[model samples]
Target chain A: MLEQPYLDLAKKVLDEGHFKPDRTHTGTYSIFGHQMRFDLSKGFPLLTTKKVPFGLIKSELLWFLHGDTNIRFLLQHRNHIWDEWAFEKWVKSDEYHGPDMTDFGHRSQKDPEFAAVYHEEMAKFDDRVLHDDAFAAKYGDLGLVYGSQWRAWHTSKGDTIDQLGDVIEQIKTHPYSRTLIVSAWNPEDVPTMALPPCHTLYQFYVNDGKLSLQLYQRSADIFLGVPFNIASYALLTHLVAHECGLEVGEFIHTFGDAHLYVNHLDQIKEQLSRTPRPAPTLQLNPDKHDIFDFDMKDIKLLNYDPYPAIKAPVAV
Target chain B: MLEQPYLDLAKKVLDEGHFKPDRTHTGTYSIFGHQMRFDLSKGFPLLTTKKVPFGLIKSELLWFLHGDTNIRFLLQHRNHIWDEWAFEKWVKSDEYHGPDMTDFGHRSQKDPEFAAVYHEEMAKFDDRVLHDDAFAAKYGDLGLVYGSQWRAWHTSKGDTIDQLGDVIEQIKTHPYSRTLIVSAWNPEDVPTMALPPCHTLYQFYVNDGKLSLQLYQRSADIFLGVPFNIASYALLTHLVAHECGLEVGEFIHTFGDAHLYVNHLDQIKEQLSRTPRPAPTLQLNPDKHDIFDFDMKDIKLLNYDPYPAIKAPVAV
Candidate 1:
């Protein structure tokens, strides 16, 4: 029942969302605007209808918190979420001596013959990013990502702004301020980025001794991305609240174009058929007050029982 | 009935909203993360419960569209809504030789003597800004305001971006783009600002031959500012759709902190007691194809029958 809001949205979109074409050449059933709220006091808002990899969520968030643009840190943590972005760069470089890999994202997923070669090249890319320092330094970096925008915003004066750090300081000193926000949508960067920030910006609201956060996500792949988004932001709220000495409150997700890709409809329908279980509880290491200092062992998820995972193709 | 969403939010905040202190030193009944949607096909979403000045909205929006950050244009149009921000800058400068108008905003609201002095000084300031070319050029510009940030985003490479113009181009060419966003919340500029953008960032969504928009406002003054915000964005959706030759869809307003200042509770309750009337329809001049080229005679509001205005003190 805790995940009813998310489930209800999926059903609504599946039934009446406008059938639309997208940049990925995949069709979608998208509705314009939607919002969902999660009360972290009850439990962590990780979905229990299908098993979610909280492990990956933790590593990715910690990566962003560290302001790490390099995929090396993620690779060290055994998370491959950012490998493709880095791999794309490596394969296109002059140093790379790989097979022809034009539009590898679409080809690898569809062509059986190309999938193995693609996977092999991806594995080699990850190995170099992990073991080779100079290679990793050159190709591991994802320019102007969440980590870069949140922690080191590029300024006109050739300086960098730490938005998240400043926001944390504002929360502690002036909890009532309404201008607590961090934005990742830069007009100059969007024209060149392979994928712009879908989680465009977020604001922190500290009231009644509790900290709540609201995210404005411009576009959403409802089936695959929404769950990860909910959990990641929920965990982010917890860590920030812990640092600010405030209780955890709501994590409200506001979406602009929330849609289910035509490819993910059956997977979403399968997910909707199962009744939601009790939301799992999160355990953060009390000693780890600084979010940046968090290690893998410092964060843990408990009682996250769910049905088997359903496979879905990413509309890249 | 068309404006029930706005009224319902007002009522909800009045009854159950959290009591909190704010940046203006005014206590407020506040709620975080609320959204309201207006279908532009029904009617332009001007509040019928109270008289709204569509004339001021038109001039101000036109100023932004023109990328004009100077208040002289607004002053010439007989709109003084932005006079305070510019006047504050002038009075704080070395050129100003006025009486000690310390804390004029709060003092002007409370002390009759100070109010008269402030009004006299403000009148002088507006006159000089209107008539004097050099003084207006130096003082009238509110640098990095919405007009500046929206149209000419300062890049690290010493170039500026035209965000709104590009968004219009995107709508015309690739209507289904999920990344049609313009951000006013620049992290590099927020710390130095007297007031950051409250109507922070907005995204445009195109589907089924219609254009819709969603705004993520970081803060809201529900009673005083929400009515104007609603009308402004609804009209914006209309104009963009007109430019792209599509039907106008919806204007979705999402807020972070939607609050009613304690001093305005009575006025809001008075507003809650009234019934909403038929909404007004907007009329745009057919000859004005480019939004940036439009002037005062180009925009109109029709059949706007409404109850009389209820006055409320601005928190600023």
Candidate 2:
């Protein structure tokens, strides 16, 4: 009898739980998206319907780890998950709406209608499709949220981060300093932004000889977003823990509107049936905790045993 | 008319909306809370209520930026927000519930349940009249999700970090990588954690050219938590934008169970009535774009005008 925490619960509830479907009231809505929040302190949240691949998890974590902001990196490891938006953003590059997506004095050329249409188009993207690279690089940048803000945040005056060495030093010596915070929300500059950030901001914590993380997500896609979030945040905890001279602690996740997509019930059940193996241990090159120091070679994982990996297609 | 774009609606709804205090779900197992989500990508999220001191916002941002997870650092310029938590973790220095906090462990010989009980008693001592320092500190520390994870993440083995700095760098150089992500969720490490991380995980984005942030917060204390989140993420956007070669963009916040505490509704109304002024612009020392190079003095806020600050007692 294999037991999965999140996936299993998702299955039981979706299959037997009382559910009601209703149209959303907001101006923009994603019909298929549902949000779920899990408290990791309770248990390991794996999709119970089918086992998730530890390698894919590691790859995705690494992608965010570097703050690439470009989906090409994610697509390199696995396209099934991150490619749709990568392609969409690529096409929607100059077209990505909102103030950030437009230039100043461009003066509301792209307005509310454009914004609504953009989302409508977004809701229609298919994850199964592949994107052109040179084109994507020219237009889309998937790693924008974490990668752009972490490594190369935009300045009002516009000069690049010339001091990589100093920032890394700060991260090491001042793990808990306000200087450690990185952000993606840029209002004054968004008129020229490509796409606005969704997972906006985060703060790190350390105390009582242990370092832990609590995440506040304003919007979450339960079926698609929640799983990726769990794996991503858990990986972040590990990375931050390693750098801050502490062992990994709990990953507490609180969510809003944690629900399942109407179409993913079977997929959810598939995830539930899979048994969870011992949680995998990530092996970072202990020598390098500096953000700028590590590349692909410096990371590895150990003893990641789980039910056979089940593949699920993502709907972007 | 003073115009508020997105947030204006929240204020209007709270102010004009009718509420019949007919309690329907009393004695029910779950008392769900009211929730709100803001697209931080729109603008600085200054509520129309009482104005937060630009100086205070700068200092608070600086504190988190400094990544000093401990509360002692917060006592200088601002009011006593984190003082109580500072003392409790100090008092109950090494208590463990096995390797984790939620696993149900007891105080060790060196650990002090007496101190924990004292702090807890102090906090709950006067539910009606007095707000004690010891009590406030306990709840504050219990809520020290960000500070703790940033400073002293403790693991079963030891504390460490994976890629906190790396992402900061990627943001500056690439400014458009899909890998831009930071999360505060780590499971194996939770039992040993003190307080959990709130303001949990964040993802960055770059559409067209502007930068944006999206946040997913699972549980929100509408009155206390929402305001801070708005300011914090907005500030983060500014700082990251300064470091990167881009400008500030929009911040999108998504939440689950964003509720106003029954205790804070009146305060919320008061806040709603206060007119919101333009958000002050953050001016960083151009010479110090390196994430670590920023010191408290290097940060400045320009032109923040609003109503007087309103004080509200927290319902922890």
Candidate 3:
């Protein structure tokens, strides 16, 4: 099956990993180094054992592709995956005059009364970001997320570089170049950022008239993030291949610290019990050649039958 | 046994890898992404099938730890591994009037007459670098090599950061931090440098009072470079562990483009035919805790038994 590697990773962590405490209070069964390969020629690697939300993955990836870091675009698409990160930024700023939201992430998970308040405050923040241009421009922009790093890398000489645009050109011109790389872990910016990039670096390879990508993510939350990451990069590879006039090859996902949070173990086991179905086929608009020109409607998934969704707590 | 994974990698590439043209003119049998792990507690990961020059490895590594980018230090220890890179710079400059050294890397390997001239010029260059302070200052410095990237990473604000020094401190204070990473892929500098870092980024992980490291190298010359890289990173893990007062764990090597040149097939097959003996034990000066203060005399190989050297042409 296309998604067997993902299932195997979860099982391997459960059976052979060591218990380790992480930044979140939630413990994890973690392993140090691991890798998985998904041949995109087979099918898109969206999980079939459990129903993964492909919609969220699509919106989030497009957001990154557009080089849009603000949550306004995401909120307009009704995708709330990035709301908390923007919300946290607002609640910590002096401009925010909301209810006491200190330690709001854990509090909302543990306390119901605080959870309601947290949701209300977050909704208000999202609405402001969606409606008010000034508010969105001020607080909505994530300073150095993947969008900025991929599209406009800041230089030592106070210049900006479009790394993604250049790499695409390289792929089109010199497909076999080994130096085709995009890195988001800028040492100058990491020390001050709230969350440094988890997907640290990625490289592209071309052979046999096919394009493949390898992502070196420094950390991963197996249950929640890995699913989205796999489908996201797979789609990215498909798009790049389309632009370069090549066929899809593979997506190699290499991990540094791959872990499953303690709270998500039951949900993951429930997920493992379900049998995987046929992998989905991704359909992209034949008219579109430029990846940056892709819209939500232009991309679609076909025959994505899967089991029901499993719920689990996120480790914030 | 500690080196079995390396042999397995070589075998896999030889058996199933695709033939591809690389940056060097030499063709290669290549695979895109692969990972191997070495338990440092088992023994050092120096290859036993071939006699790798431990002396060069030691001097070169200590040069990086000290953040010294000049070839003078390496030459002082009679380590000429990096002499070619520095010599290339000198031979290409306007000051070089002795010979037309264009395409000298391949030319020296192909023609015996040119090889003799290249040898004389390189010898003269090395002598000048060793004795003449002004001349050495002009050409001996590899401005953006591993030494500078590991130690003094340049910032946008016209400042420098000691990344290796800070990482060591982080390992001492917060061993379990997921952000314990040092990156060498500076987008601002890669376009101008002759050879960008292949050992791109590395992260440290700690569990049960043991420290582990994972390197994500963007390109790997499997036959010649991979062995040195394995031992280099293993030694780094040992030094960091010693400074942090922790036991050694594992060294995980992950690659993006791992390839063996066409000329290396017979040598690799010879290496595979030999049985690996017990791995060597590395002896570091226990009295020294600060890695930056290390010298060549402070490190030694306790017992190394290996087959005679196997010769293979460098791809250049």
lDDT of 1 by residue, A112-225 (tens): 989999999999889988899998899998877899899999888889999999999999999999988888888888898998989998999999999999999889988999
What tens-digit string does per-residue lDDT give for candidate 1 at B198-265?
A: 98989999888888999988888899989999888888888888888889888999999999999998
Q: What is the C-alpha lDDT of each candidate?
A: 0.90, 0.50, 0.91
Best by lDDT: 3
After aligning candidate 1 to the native by TM-score, how far in Å is the CA of A14 from where it should be? Answer: 1.0
Candidate 1 chain B TM? Answer: 0.98
Candidate 3 per-residue lDDT, tens place, B1-316, comes to 8899999999999999999998887899999999999999899999998999988888888999989999999999899988888999888888888888898988988899999999999999999999999988989998888898999998989899998899888888887789999999998888777888999999999999999999998888889999899989999998888889999999999999999999999999989999999999988889998878988877888789999999888887
Cα displacement (Å) at residue B98, model 2: 29
- Write the number of the candidate with greater TM-score, choosing between 1 and 2: 1
- DockQ per candidate, 2 decimals: 0.91, 0.03, 0.87
Instruction: Output DockQ, candidate 2.
Output: 0.03
- Please give, as one word, the docking class of candidate 3: high
Clashing pairs in 1: none
User: Which of 1 and 2 is the better model by lDDT?
Assistant: 1
Which digits, one per residue and each the tens of the lDDT, describe model 2 over residues B1-316?
2225334434533554333121211110111112233343444566545666555566666666655553434544643455454444434446322223221122322257644654454334233112445543443334335544443343333434433454667666665354466566443233245543446566566544566766655445555666667777777777877777676666656543244445556666676665556555566788877755576788766665667666664443
Error of 2 at A250 (Å): 27
